[PDB]
Amino acid sequence: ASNENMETM
């Protein structure tokens, strides 16, 4: 299963 990133760059 894929991962959802936290805070943006």
Place this chain on the structure above:
Amino acid sequence: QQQVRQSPQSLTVWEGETAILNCSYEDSTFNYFPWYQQFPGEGPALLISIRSVSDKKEDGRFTIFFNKREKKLSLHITDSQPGDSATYFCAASEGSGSWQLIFGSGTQLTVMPNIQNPDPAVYQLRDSKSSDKSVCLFTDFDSQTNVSQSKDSDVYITDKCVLDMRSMKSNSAVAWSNKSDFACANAFNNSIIPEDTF
């Protein structure tokens, strides 16, 4: 810059007249231009918006005249009502990022209402306790005359306030002081209409 700059800082116009609220932007890539209206003690609400495709947006009285060749916006309010007295903000957002709205400082609009029958008079108002306080009220005066602060730390005088009453409008000012033997005639710091006491 972006910037966004708006002109003027504060605009005052009489009831029934046309109010013009100018705006200027630097970034040419700006496409969406919304206009927000906020009343004292209330957040900004979406009034009317305009896109880069069109150059005119009509919604009864409120109209935006967009000019791409001069990078400027203008909000026209035909037949100005006293209920329009609010702070007007203008935002702008480009293509790639529509979430980032670059707002302007804002224009504080003040619509002076038309006083049909002026009856200026100073009234003595007593407290509903034990008491011993007394408040002076200067009411039913025209929008033209002004009230001063009465250069004294002990005497407190408020600015003009217009009521509605549903049945149809009057301007009012409140004057009070903790000082013993303070008469309601004492408003001799600013010029008023000759009328009316006891």
Place this chain on the structure above:
Amino acid sequence: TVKQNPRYKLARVGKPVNLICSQTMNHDTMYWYQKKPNQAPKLLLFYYDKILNREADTFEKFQSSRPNNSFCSLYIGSAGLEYSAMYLCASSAGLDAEQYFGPGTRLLVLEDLKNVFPPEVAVFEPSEAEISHTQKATLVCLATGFYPDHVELSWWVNGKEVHSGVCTDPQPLKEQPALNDSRYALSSRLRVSATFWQNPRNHFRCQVQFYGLSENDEWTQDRAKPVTQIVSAEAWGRA
């Protein structure tokens, strides 16, 4: 449509602040803006569903939390004098859609809470000469000795809040302008019919909502804690 409670927030320097915002529109995106006096509202941060974005010049000063999509909060820790501004919260269905703003939370940060005081509300009965000259009766309200500028005035007639024939000053007067940390004074007007004031069963109340200290706020003074309280003054009609 977009809730923001309280309307006014007070905090001491070095103490953490958490401003809460909520929406019933089931929106994916919720924004946070900073509004300085007579300055353009600048975007601080936003929350798209789960994803958080902070501005390169804003971060290190502001933090953000989201318990669920219906809520959104702005965190400050520690608080300073430069943080004293109006905090607006926006809401949008999509990332590239129309934004709906909340009423805003006015934040004021002070070095010490020693000068914080609740208001003294007093109602003034209409003048007998006013009922004789004109066929109207004006009731004057007076909120005095309150600090800070955090007040909400509302007129209540027969248990219901009345907006028609009501006028409150845009900014309260400083009781002692010659010195800093001075208490404010706000006045209001309620104009009703002469026959309406003549009725003895008609009730008139001037409610003033004050925003001061809370549960987390520390108080070490002998004087009573100036908590977020409601101060009212009532008056009945006479013929």
Place this chain on the structure above:
Amino acid sequence: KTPQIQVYSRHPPENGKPNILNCYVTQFHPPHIEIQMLKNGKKIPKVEMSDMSFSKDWSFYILAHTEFTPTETDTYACRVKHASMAEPKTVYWDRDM
């Protein structure tokens, strides 16, 4: 990054027996690239292209293949157009490589 091209057949080349001609393009950025497979200097219309993929060194890679019958007289090539290159690189098919 300049794209690296390799022209080869799926199965060992044999005159008469049908085969599949591959054009493995590697080590390029941005991912936008134009690949044309040639037969005697003329472009092949039916060219099956694989979906966009990249390697551990962030470089993108793509494989283009067409149905072909090898002959000793016919010449095969692969023309590649990319932003990193001024002139398109044309690599000719060799059965010995």
Place this chain on the structure above:
Amino acid sequence: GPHSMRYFETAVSRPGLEEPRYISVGYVDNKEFVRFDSDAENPRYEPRAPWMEQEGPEYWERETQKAKGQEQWFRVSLRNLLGYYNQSAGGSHTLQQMSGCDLGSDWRLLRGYLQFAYEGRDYIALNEDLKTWTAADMAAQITRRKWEQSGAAEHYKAYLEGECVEWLHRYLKNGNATLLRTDSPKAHVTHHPRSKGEVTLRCWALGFYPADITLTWQLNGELTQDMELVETRPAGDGTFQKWASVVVPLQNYTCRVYHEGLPEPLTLRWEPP
């Protein structure tokens, strides 16, 4: 056994377009199993492996919703990077991501991966410890400072150790007949004469799975830079090809083939018939 799950993400900006192209490619043991593409008629996580058909609609809908959020994460991050480098609004920009883990021995977790790229070059990467970040430039240091305060690394470590390991175990069980499949290479030496009295012996290797192979030439013992080599190329039917050649005088030389599909390493010479 060396097993690994990877997610290769890409975000390409279009000239003037409000929405960029987002592609997420999933891999299990270096072979593709899942793929998402924003360009498609109906953007959904589509199965790319035959064993992936076992999953119901619950798995596909959950992954598509994850991709929709990631599609917007990459959109904002790409615009934030334009502000960092102070670049023009209109242009072609690429944001890449590599995330996943290696199992090791046996089904326990060996190494964690989380890397980011901009314009093809490295930007920010999560270290071996899975707690610190390596910034390639000063623009990446701002991203590092942002992620250090918010504690982004703490949640990325939770995926690589938890969900990434847990889901890879399931994919190895569901897909076993085609995943643990090994194909032995077909090896042969060709003759190519040259001028100056030299000849090139080309050691071929065709039809092998996985792509990992070692081809070396020997002069009784060890020939390093003088030996010609080409990159491992796919045939098209899920198998690979590769060759190694060496310039020798007008001769009996040894080629060594190393592959997991074959039990004993292949040692071969040239004919002629």
